[PDB]
């Protein structure tokens, strides 16, 4: 993506080097008092929260390119005690202290706009998925996640749109939709298999009825059309 | 809130004049091709979406002072087909076409950062609620919004924290929920005291809405302080 690529060059030409991360490592963690701007360039992460008793709550998944900020831009204080965990095999990220980010975005408002609108995408995304979960429950949520994965990682084949994403575990798909006990994930997947919306062949899901997914995750479909029209359009 | 006041003054000095809306009016709506940045100075609004079914879903509640942007700052296209509806009797809001917001914010970045941080508040807020609901189901969820009412509209009284928000608007907000409420009052958390309900056990709400309590501490520290 162009704006991301420009942002990447802006950061590098200002002395910020890319870091390489590996599966299961934390780019930032919930016990660090320093807050950061993470430019996740390539790879997949998840935001997590570890509770009092050690329970791990998976709250949000992100793919590069994207901007995750662990602290408020103005106060530089924490927006929440969260970790950012790499779930792809490796990931490339630029880690900027928030105070350094303010100075960087201050000097080029084109990049300020890019980061601002990334936040706007996150806001409307959470609203869209709450909208879909409120109407259709876990089915809307699972349909939404599958739709997003289909738009981002889909490859049309004679067997349907192949979700070309490795390590796409059922519980990993469950977590990304908001479902901890994988009882519900396997069940919803069974309804979608029975109604021929998806098949699971080789190691991937193949979407056979995109219209069905869009029908039960309509607000997330609209979110993708408004936020990423060029990606939405490739499969519409 | 100080950044908000300075933002209000910054808008007025640049000609932006506020408008008072009344309950059920739409400050912006899902059918308008033009997008807006709303500085909600005073009052209570809800973000709604009217589905194809004709169903009206309540997605978010906003209280002044706060900023709600119906369109992307760069592209000026919609972030979603949403309405912003007034649920307080009146509300004061500054309505800025998003074209103009870009120039307003470029001139003074202190206010750019203010608007930027309202977005971060929304993002973290949604994740905090999702965390509580995923751990404690509907109990966390109920506890969460009882916690919100307690913090935003809580007065220390002899009988606990009286929810001081006008009960005219309490209805807007409000299945298995009846049972959850009964166990609440059953377990003394909230007391039915002549239709003036009181929160008698903040620690219980805090216990089952922990990530939302943390969000208030981190995002609204003055508000969080009063009842802690
Ligand atoms: C193993 C596993 C499991 C689930 C999963 N989900 C993935 N991808 C996504 O969830 C889409 S990435 C994304 N997330 C968000 C926003 C966003 O803009 N994106 C995004 C980024 C780049 C391109 C398209 C969408 S705003 C708030 C969350 S991977 C992934 C990998
Ligand atoms: Na941290
Ligand atoms: Na609109």
Residue numbers in the entry:
A (entry chain A): 2 to 237
B (entry chain B): 2 to 175, 184 to 237
Structure paper excerpt:
The asymmetric unit of the PrfA:IWP-2 complex crystals contained one PrfA dimer composed of monomers A and B. Difference Fourier and Polder electron density maps unambiguously confirmed binding of IWP-2 to PrfA in monomer A, at the AI site, but not the BI site in monomer B. IWP-2 bound at the AI site with mostly hydrophobic interactions, as well as one direct hydrogen bond with the side chain of Gln146, and one water-mediated hydrogen with the side chains of Gln61, Tyr126 and Gln146. The ring-fused pyrimidone group of IWP-2 was positioned at site S1 in the vicinity of the aromatic side chains of residues Tyr126 and Phe67. However, the binding of IWP-2 likely prevents the collapse of the N-terminal PrfA domain, a process otherwise necessary to line up the folded HTH motifs—one in each monomer—in positions compatible with palindromic DNA binding. As a result, in the IWP-2-bound PrfA structure, even though it is folded, the HTH motif has a position not compatible with DNA binding. IWP-2 was 2.6-times more potent in inhibiting hly expression of L. monocytogenes in liquid culture compared to the recently described bicyclic 4-(1-naphthylmethyl)-2-pyridone PrfA inhibitor, KSK67 (15); IWP-2 IC50 = 0.026 μM versus KSK67 IC50 = 0.067 μM.
Expression of these L. monocytogenes virulence genes is controlled by positive regulatory factor A, PrfA. Transcription factors of this family bind a wide range of ligands and are activated by allosteric communication between the ligand binding site and DNA-binding helix-turn-helix (HTH) motifs.
